[PDB]
Design a protein around this nucleic acid. Structure first.
Ligand SMILES: [Mg+2]
Ligand SMILES: [Zn+2]
Lengths: 652, 1319
DNA sequence: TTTTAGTCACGGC
RNA sequence: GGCUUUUUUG
DNA sequence: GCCGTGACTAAAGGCAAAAAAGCC
């Protein structure tokens, strides 16, 4: 390829070929002149070396280099390696009809929609617009269509809106560790230059809005669009392929809102009044005549599917709060009222969604998830929950406890000098004393933080669970955990050296108060270690994934039932303490290799070749079954594949 | 005390600990290094002088001719730094060296001089350090970071029992020289000593040891202790001492003098050892079997037969005992060889030695050095002599010898730069001792083992390499001797030295490209300690040991400032007070503590010497006399931390900022943040973009002034004076009377840089910050640069922030920004992009620049002139033409603005080759700079003429000429007036002489400037002319832009919201930014909340001042309030008194505080919560810091109070408009026919193998077939796919990818046949 | 640099 | 328009 | 002399993005 200037851009291969041909020509001219064998042997050896360099450079020894003093690229090196043809131009290749942008958050979208910038959409869907533009006669030739598109007329926007009615696009985030990293969406034309993403899918994408970038692709043929809609679209991917747990779990902002909504207070505005129903509870809260969470009595109609798949009404008076009654207006028909009567932390809310998927299917589940997100966002905005420097309550006994702990080591330092205590046992005693002191400080801080004093209606002091903001974020599961709250109020605890030894003197200062120069220096030993491990663990983990994909790339289900009685005996795992995994989970969603025998002789509890689902598992639990033999893929006799039955149940 | 430059805005400074050592010049790591490289050193120790003395003098092979070094000098640089940047040439100076060639007579005795020739040689060109510690190479501005390698010397290491399965430890010793081959002594699992040179094949140790002319008897005597045996009656005894019996077992009943001393059979006892000590009995009776394990020391032969009886290191039996007894040899010598104390590692190595002639040993060494070659004695001797004991091929340098002598517990630190007999003997003995329990191993990560190699040392090494190449060339040239035919100018070629220096400065792993997007990034890049590069680690071979933080980094290397990702802990940054020792090691200040009293005598302690003393902690409370108020204090002794006594302390830290670097010291409330968040905050603060109008940080640290002044972005007055003239592009200072030199008083002129492109395409701009007729002093800022406000660093703005969730628009890390922020252009930035069009001479006719372009309308050429170069100031857009270029055929090759960016051409620089016709735009530009030069020279001449005529009037008036008559006389006639005073007449004549010489000097200067500017240019061959265009884009903030804080709380703006929807407080003031509270608990960066609460208090004071000024209240009431605010605090260090300030000064200060009174907070000595509450109570704000807002859209009160305050926001350099990308159909590659990659080439996103697996995990097969064939590389399947879509059909054809056929040919290009088969 | 495996040369009774 | 070396983001 | 042991040599070690250079 010619570059800018008299110099020409040549590859490493041309130099090797020139070397080989020049050596061959020299040998041909020299051999025909009856030259002495002293030079002939050396010339032949040099030709051998040149051909060796051309075919594979560097294998023998010092690779021949060019002016750059870098080894040249030979044919063998052009294939092998990460830069080789196989792993760079065959397995993964660059594609057209694709774009890349920064992702922001849009809470007004539905689960199956994403925001697409107008410029990105018009660049991506250029060929489709040309077809419609000439179809309606707005442009005769293709050149006229191209000129009309670039000028950015007004009808072009209407045409673009028309061609993005039900045309899915594939949103993608690198790295795409699991199959949920590529998802189909129905784009929505928006302004700006950022791809608006639905919050609920952020758990699947493992994406955060701090500079992340995502790539969008466009299916072209009818088959690809239908495949996207039927297999990839986010309304169809709500269960993990690795386990039955959902991937549309609300988190962070939603959880805090739903926790603040459904959380009673002993005394509030408008307490003890009786309401006609959930609709009235919304009219009171908006009017300001009743607080969002006051204990009231309301009449609720709940529908249960105890019949043969038929809904039956049921009315009762429930003792609940305005927040739970308001939230009940969005839950679907099948669910009972005991679901929305608790505090609804992070782990409860997910279970609620799971319950819906167990009862009402998929469409009610996704509609309920969207309503959950909207209500949580609204009533989290209305709460005005904030973190302040006064919200981190330091326990009052803390310093006293520390002093006492100091006294303890003040003893041992003396006792070590009297010979009664040696070096190692003194170290162990000091470590144990400081650990006990840290545990006591943490317990005292938690007891102080988790309760508050408030006067009830009668005028007596009554204790209730605190409304402290940091405790609300810690308890609801929205953000943080016990360790972070401990490190913000209680002492940070003992720190370890880079090698692994624990520092004798712990960090007795929390983040709310200052940390001196010495403590902050010894607190970076752990941080740098963790950062280095995180940086160097991505390279190792991903590699492993490759070695797991290439070994098992060609295993595809190809049979319905191999008809084999071989299996593996599955029992609950016990390590000497509590059971790590119950038998129910290790056998759920599989098929028995043979009929399960009751402890009573000759009784068949489970028929052979039957799929065990949750309903059968509950029957297994009440009967208190001990061990169930089931089929496995490793015991299958199908050739070049695995039958459907031995694998079991599709978790997704 | 306060000067007028800081009286404008005094920063309220919290902090209790008085400061002792002022922060040093931050660039002294660079400036003080290169200064040693190009300075004249009469002792010949540093830099060029030592580099020349290390090679010269030169002697011929025949010894009849020689070259002498005399001296050297550095010339004036041909172009100034600004001219070098504009013209794209290196700012460098020529090197002139005086050489003397003297030829000796061949037939005369040594020392007979025949001829002496002295001449200067243009030896090369040395790049120079700019005043800011940076290099200009090719129109760019590079920085050479300081390496951190292992100091030359001897290092003892252990394998920690990981190599062998048995877990045994394998000690070893390495001898790292500054230049030459390595040397290693190491053990094996079988306890055999081994030696390896340059990591080559393992050899037995004694093989090299006997290469130094050793006899085995001497080796055994040197490496062991002798035991004496005397053949008495019927037995042979030894003299015995208790010290030679410790930790042994009695093979027989150890007894003497007829009394039992030690028991029989069992192990020895210490009580019997003491009994032997007190008895003092030497000779003891010995049985026969006790000798069966001993080894004879020296050779013994018979004097009658003359044959060898017993050899060195040979086991002996009763036969040899009888043979020696019958020969009369009463004295026998054996070795100590005790397992516990003196391990028998030498004896077993002597057993495994293949030979004992030292000639076979030398042959084996030669074979190991290089295989497959005859073992000639002369070649092997030369190799052994030159491998360690030749100064040419081996050098330990001064630091290496110092470490070598220190590690072996010697006394002197000066010696030869090469090894010797004693060095290797001592290394082996120390390694054996280490293997034998005594002694300890070294630590590689220790900062006492790693030193700093600055830019001066690197340049000296490269220059020496080039000089050695020139030495070889001149030696091979002088080999052809001649009688005075040569002149010492053709013998020396500057090309090798120039090429080596140029390649080192231009293309290297350490001469990095300086990133100047704000002063902080420049300072941090200049003060960097990189561990990579030549003679250092690599990003792949480094493990978890070098990447980790060591206890000795306290005060030398920052713990919390290191880049994340592939190299963390390898590119750590230097601390604040840390400087470089004499040898290159780090060192930190420490206040010596005498008799329990802390003094102010600063001692610079290095790493290793930190161990011996006990060092107190920085923030330890004291009295006014330095006495520790507490009898117990915190200290560190050997990387530890424990409670000591107040009398056991020996040193104390100077300040609390000593442990952190600059970037981490600019973060307020650092002690309240997690280390990871502090790291992220420093790294992102290093990335801030300069805004349109700089705004001071309300909460700072006090290092802002130091960082702003030290970086070369603020124009600092050299001498004090009064501002005679102030302008947007120049400042003129009339120097004060006390600061003029005796001659050529003159004035000072500073020329600012306006809208010059930076390295990161940002805008560098300087604005005057002084008023007309305002006094100034030395060191005072006269013009703040980018990201600076009145000589104070300011990278971002300060916004009213609220911590609350708002309808999900701040979900995970997103930020919600009001439209009032966009309206005021607070975060609007300026970017400058450079486009270059080059006219080359291609075939089929040269390319021309003209306005004649076909197939284009008049609109596309209206912005162009008839010259074809766009007018300056034309609001160009994407797709237009800047320079009209066409190539003959004719084809349009005109340079165009890349799409997606607007522009406004602000500068067009044209370079035209010498002897080439200049276009009209070139003529206009050249007239422009010649007019500029004429104006500049005229202004200088007028200023000097004014000074000269003032002197003339002063002289003439003092000479008896009346002032009125002199004023009424013409200026020229003043010199012609006759004076009755001869002294005055002589002075006037001298003034007239200066007049004439001055006009001649300006005429010569004008002619020189005319000739220089009008002359042609030197540039790359094959180029007709070069034209450059600059475009100025004005970026704003839009949804997608990345913002951040100082505490690591980054985010992406998710919505630009109307002002009527922002939450508003009781007074109706909307907030500007809404942040998510939930990011505080998990991330544990409580610094942002405290900063918000403090900024809310700080702005409360400023608003009250804004209220007093609006009411036009008197100074007396105003001055009272400002004093009240500045007097607040508990034991505040700063004491500001307004009594010394005049009324105008107080009014100006209050005028500079109406935007909020600034607050200073040191890093680890910051304001506590009580001070913040007291500051809040001074204003009219709640103490809790949480106010009650309202919902903007509904008007309903929020159910809880929320945190509102002012927080400092930065706009990072990751803009969405530079990242958005899309592609339908573009240009494709050449070999694989796949779409290109990257935004510049309009490339498509890579669909990697992980995405292929993701699609395979679904049932998606048609989508995969699309992505693989019809979108990527199926040439026959994608042209039809495009046609089908435009036709309304949506259907593919599988085709056959063209990226797989090539592979076949590739494999078919080898001897392998791979082919497809039948249908 | 570290890990791992495959292959050639040496070893001991 | 290919390669290499640095820097940065996730 | 045959199975056991030590020494010698080859392959492999994230994914996407940008921004610079410098060479060929
Ligand atoms: Mg992220
Ligand atoms: Zn099967």
């Amino acid at each position: 390829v010619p570059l800018d200037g008299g110099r020409f851009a040549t590859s490493d291969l041309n130099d090797l070929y020139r070397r080989v041909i020049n050596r061959n020509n020299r040998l041909k001219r020299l051999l025909d002149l009856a030259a002495p064998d002293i030079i002939v042997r050396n010339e032949k050896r040099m030709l051998q070396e040149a051909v060796d360099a051309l075919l594979d450079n560097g294998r023998r020894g010092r690779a021949i280099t060019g002016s750059n003093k870098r080894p040249l690229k030979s044919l063998a090196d052009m294939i092998k390696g990460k830069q080789g043809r196989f792993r760079q131009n065959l397995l993964g290749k660059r594609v057209d009809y694709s774009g890349r942008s920064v992702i922001t958050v849009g809470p007004y979208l539905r689960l199956h929609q994403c925001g697409l910038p107008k410029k990105m959409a018009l660049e991506l869907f250029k060929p489709f617009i040309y077809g419609k533009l000439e179809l309606r006669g707005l442009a005769t030739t293709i050149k006229a269509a191209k000129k009309m598109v670039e000028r950015e007329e007004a009808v072009v926007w209407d045409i673009l809106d028309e061609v993005i009615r039900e045309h899915p696009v594939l949103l993608n985030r690198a790295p795409t560790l699991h199959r949920l990293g590529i998802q189909a969406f129905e784009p929505v034309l928006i302004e700006g230059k950022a791809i608006q993403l639905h919050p609920l899918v952020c758990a699947a994408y493992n994406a955060d809005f701090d500079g992340d970038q995502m790539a969008v692709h466009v299916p072209l043929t009818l088959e690809a669009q239908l495949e996207a809609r039927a297999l990839m679209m986010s309304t169809n991917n709500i269960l993990s392929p690795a386990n039955g747990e959902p991937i549309i779990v609300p988190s962070q902002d939603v959880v805090l809102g739903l926790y603040y909504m459904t959380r009673d207070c002993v005394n509030a505005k408008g307490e003890g009044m009786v309401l006609t129903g959930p609709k009235e509870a919304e009219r009171l809260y908006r009017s300001g005549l009743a607080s969002l969470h006051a204990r009231v009595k309301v009449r609720i109609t709940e529908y249960e599917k105890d019949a043969n798949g038929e809904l039956v009404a049921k009315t009762s008076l429930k003792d609940t709060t305005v927040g739970r009654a308001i939230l009940w207006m969005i839950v679907p028909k099948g669910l009972p009222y005991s679901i929305v009567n608790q505090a609804l932390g992070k782990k409860a809310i997910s279970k609620m969604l799971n319950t819906c998927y167990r009862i009402l299917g998929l469409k009610p589940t996704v509609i309920f998830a969207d309503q959950i997100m909207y209500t949580g966002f609204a009533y989290a905005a209305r709460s005005g929950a904030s973190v302040g420097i006064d919200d981190m309550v330091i326990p009052e006994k803390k310093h006293e406890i520390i002093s006492e702990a100091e006294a303890e080591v003040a003893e041992i330092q003396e006792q070590f000098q009297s010979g009664l205590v040696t070096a190692g046992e003194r170290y162990n005693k000091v470590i144990d004393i400081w650990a006990a002191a840290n545990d006591r400080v943490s317990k005292a801080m938690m007891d102080n933080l988790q309760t508050e004093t408030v006067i009830n209606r009668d005028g007596q002091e009554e204790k209730q669970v605190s409304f402290n903001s940091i405790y609300m974020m810690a308890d609801s599961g929205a953000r943080g955990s016990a360790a972070q709250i401990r490190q913000l109020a209680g002492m940070r605890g003992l720190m370890a050296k880079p090698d692994g030894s624990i520092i004798e003197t712990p960090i007795t200062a929390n983040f709310r108060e200052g940390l001196n120069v010495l403590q902050y220096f010894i607190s970076t030993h752990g941080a740098r270690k963790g950062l280095a491990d995180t940086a160097l663990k991505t390279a190792n983990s991903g590699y492993l994934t490759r070695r797991l994909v290439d070994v098992a790339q060609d295993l595809v289900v190809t049979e319905d039932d191999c008809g084999t009685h071989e299996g593996i005996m599955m029992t609950p795992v016990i390590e000497g303490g509590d059971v790590k995994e119950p038998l129910r989970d290790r056998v759920l969603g599989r098929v028995t290799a043979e009929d399960v025998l009751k402890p009573g002789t000759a009784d068949i509890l489970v028929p052979r070749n039957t799929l065990l689902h949750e309903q059968w598992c509950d029957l297994l639990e009440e009967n208190s079954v001990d061990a169930v033999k089931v089929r496995s893929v490793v015991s299958c006799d199908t050739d070049f594949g695995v039958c459907a039955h031995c694998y079991g149940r599709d978790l997704a | 005390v306060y000067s007028y430059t800081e009286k404008k805005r005094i920063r309220k400074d919290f902090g209790k600990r008085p400061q002792v050592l002022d922060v040093p010049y931050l660039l002294s790591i660079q400036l003080d290094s290169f200064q040693k490289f190009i300075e004249q050193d009469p002792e010949g120790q540093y830099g060029l002088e030592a580099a020349f003395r290390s090679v010269f003098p030169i002697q011929s092979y025949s010894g009849n001719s020689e070259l002498q070094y005399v001296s050297y000098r550095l010339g004036e640089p041909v172009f100034d730094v600004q001219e070098c940047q504009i013209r794209g040439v290196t700012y460098s100076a020529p090197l002139r060296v005086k050489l003397r060639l003297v030829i000796y007579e061949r037939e005369a005795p040594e020392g007979t001089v025949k001829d002496i020739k002295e001449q200067e040689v243009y030896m090369g060109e040395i790049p120079l350090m700019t005043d800011n510690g940076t290099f200009v190479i090719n129109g760019t501005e590079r920085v050479i970071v300081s390496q951190l390698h292992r100091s030359p010397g001897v290092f003892f290491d252990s394998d920690k029992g990981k190599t062998h399965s048995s877990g045994k430890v394998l000690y070893n010793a390495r001898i790292i020289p500054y230049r030459g081959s390595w040397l290693d002594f190491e053990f094996d699992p079988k306890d055999n000593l081994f030696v390896r040179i340059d990591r080559r094949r393992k050899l037995p140790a004694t093989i090299i040891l006997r290469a130094l002319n050793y006899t085995t008897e001497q080796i055994l005597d040197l490496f062991f202790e002798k035991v004496i045996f005397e053949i008495r009656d019927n037995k042979l005894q030894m003299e015995l001492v208790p010290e030679r019996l410790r930790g042994e077992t009695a093979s027989f009943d150890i007894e003497a003098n007829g009394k039992v001393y030690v028991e029989k059979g069992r192990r020895i006892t210490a009580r019997h050892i003491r009994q032997l000590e007190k008895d003092d009995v030497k000779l003891i009776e010995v049985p026969v079997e006790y000798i069966a394990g001993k080894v004879v020391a020296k050779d013994y032969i018979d004097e009658s037969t003359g044959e060898l009886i017993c050899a060195a290191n040979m086991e002996l039996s009763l036969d040899l005992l009888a043979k020696l007894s019958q020969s009369g040899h009463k004295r026998i010598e054996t070795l100590f060889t005790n397992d516990l104390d003196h391990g028998p590692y030498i004896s077993e190595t002597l057993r495994v030695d293949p030979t004992n002639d030292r000639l076979s040993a030398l042959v084996e060494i030669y074979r190991m050095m290089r295989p497959g070659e005859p073992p000639t004695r002369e070649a092997a001797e030369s190799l052994f002599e030159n491998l360690f004991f030749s100064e040419d091929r081996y050098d330990l340098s001064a630091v290496g010898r110092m470490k070598f002598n220190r590690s072996l517990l010697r006394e002197e630190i000066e010696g030869s730069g090469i090894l010797s007999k004693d060095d290797i003997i001592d290394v082996m003995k120390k390694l054996i001792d280490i293997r034998n329990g005594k002694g300890e191993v070294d630590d590689i990560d220790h900062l006492g083992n790693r030193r700093i190699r600055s830019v001066g040392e690197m340049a000296e090494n490269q220059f020496r390499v080039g000089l050695v190449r020139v030495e070889r060339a001149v030696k091979e040239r002088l080999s052809l001797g001649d009688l005075d035919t040569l002149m010492p100018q053709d013998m020396i070629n500057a090309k090798p030295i120039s090429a080596a220096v140029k390649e080192f400065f231009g293309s290297s792993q350490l001469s990095q490209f300086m990133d100047q997007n704000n002063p902080l990034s420049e300072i941090t890049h200049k003060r960097r300690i990189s561990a990579l590069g030549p003679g250092g680690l690599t990003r792949e071979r480094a493990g978890f040991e070098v990447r980790d933080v060591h206890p000795t980094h306290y005060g030398r290397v920052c713990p919390i400032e290191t880049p994340e990702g592939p190299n963390i802990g390898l590119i750590n940054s230097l601390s604040v007070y840390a400087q470089t020792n004499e040898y290159g090691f780090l060192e930190t200040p420490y206040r010596k503590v005498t008799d329990g009293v802390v003094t102010d005598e600063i001692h610079y302690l290095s790493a290793i010497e930190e161990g011996n003393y006990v060092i107190a902690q920085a923030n330890s409370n004291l009295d006014e006399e330095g006495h520790f108020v507490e009898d117990l204090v915190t200290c560190r002794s050997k990387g530890e931390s424990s409670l000591f006594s107040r009398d056991q302390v020996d040193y104390m830290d100077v300040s609390t900022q000593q442990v952190v670097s600059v970037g981490a010291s600019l973060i307020p409330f650092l002690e309240h943040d997690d280390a990871n968040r502090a790291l992220m905050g420093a790294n992102m603060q290093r990335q801030a973009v300069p805004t349109l109008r700089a705004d001071k940080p309300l909460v700072g640290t006090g290092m802002e002034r130091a960082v702003a002044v030290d970086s070369g972005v603020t124009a600092v007055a050299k001498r004090g004076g009064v501002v005679q003239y102030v302008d947007a592009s120049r400042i003129v200072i009339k120097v004060n009377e006390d600061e003029m030199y005796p001659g050529e008083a003159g004035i000072d002129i500073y020329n600012l840089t306006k809208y010059t492109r930076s390295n990161q395409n940002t805008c560098i701009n300087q604005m005057p910050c002084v008023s007309l007729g305002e006094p100034v002093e030395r060191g005072d800022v006269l013009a703040d640069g980018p990201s600076t406000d009145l000589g104070e660093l300011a990278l971002g703005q300060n916004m009213r922030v609220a911590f609350m969730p708002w309808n999900g628009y701040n979900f995970e890390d997103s930020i919600l920004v009001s439209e009032r922020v966009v309206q005021e252009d607070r975060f609007t930035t300026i970017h400058i992009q450079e486009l270059a069009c080059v006219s080359r001479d291609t075939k089929l006719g040269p390319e021309e620049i003209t306005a004649d372009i076909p197939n284009v309308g008049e609109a596309a050429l209206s912005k162009l002139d008839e010259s074809g170069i766009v007018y300056i100031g034309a609001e160009v857009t994407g797709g237009d033409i800047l320079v009209g270029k066409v190539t003959p055929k004719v084809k349009d090759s005109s340079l165009r603005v890349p799409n997606g960016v607007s522009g406004t051409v602000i500068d067009v620089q044209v370079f035209t080759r010498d002897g080439v016709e200049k276009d009209k735009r070139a003529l206009e530009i050249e007239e422009m700079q010649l007019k500029q030069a004429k104006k500049d020279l005229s202004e200088e001449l007028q200023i000097l003429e004014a000074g000269l005529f003032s002197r003339i009037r002063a002289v003439l008036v003092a000479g008896g000429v009346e002032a009125e008559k002199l004023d009424k006389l013409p200026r020229d006639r003043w010199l012609e007036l006759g004076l009755t005073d001869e002294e005055k007449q002589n002075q006037l004549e001298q003034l007239a002489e200066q007049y004439d010489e001055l006009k001649h000097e300006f005429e010569k200067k004008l002619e020189a400037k005319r000739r220089k500017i009008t002359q042609g240019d030197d540039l790359a061959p094959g180029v007709l002319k070069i034209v450059k265009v600059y475009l100025a884009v004005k970026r704003r903030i839009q949804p997608g832009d990345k913002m951040a804080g100082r505490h690591g709380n980054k985010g992406v703006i998710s919505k630009i919201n109307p002002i009527e929807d922002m939450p508003y407080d009781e007074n109706g003031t909307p907030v500007d930014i809404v942040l998510n509270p939930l990011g505080v608990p998990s991330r544990m960066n409580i610094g942002q909340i405290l900063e918000t609460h403090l900024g809310m208090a700080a702005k409360g004071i400023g608003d009250k001042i804004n209220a007093m000024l609006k009411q036009q209240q008197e100074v007396a009431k105003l001055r009272e309030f400002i004093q009240r605010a500045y007097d607040l605090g508990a034991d505040v260090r700063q004491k500001v008194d307004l009594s010394t300030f005049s009324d105008e000064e107080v009014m100006r200060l209050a005028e500079n505080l109406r935007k909020g009174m600034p607050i200073a907070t040191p890093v680890f000595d910051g304001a506590k919560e009580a001070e913040i509450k007291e500051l809040l109570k001074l204003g009219d704000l709640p103490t809790s810091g949480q106010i009650r807002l309202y919902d903007g859209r509904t008007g309903e009160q929020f159910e809880r109070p929320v945190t509102v305050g002012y927080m400092y926001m930065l706009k990072l350099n990751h803009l969405v408009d530079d990242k958005m990308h899309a592609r339908s159909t573009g240009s494709y590659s050449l070999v694989t026919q796949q779409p290109l990659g990257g935004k510049a080439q309009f490339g498509g996103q890579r669909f990697g193998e992980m995405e292929v697996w993701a699609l395979e995990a679904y049932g998606a097969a048609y989508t995969l077939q699309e992505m693989l064939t019809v979108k990527s590389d199926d040439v026959n399947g994608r042209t039809k796919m495009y046609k089908n879509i435009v036709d309304g059909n949506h259907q593919m054809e599988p085709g056959m990818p063209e990226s797989f056929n090539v592979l076949l040919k590739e494999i078919r290009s080898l001897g392998i046949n791979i082919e497809l088969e039948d249908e």
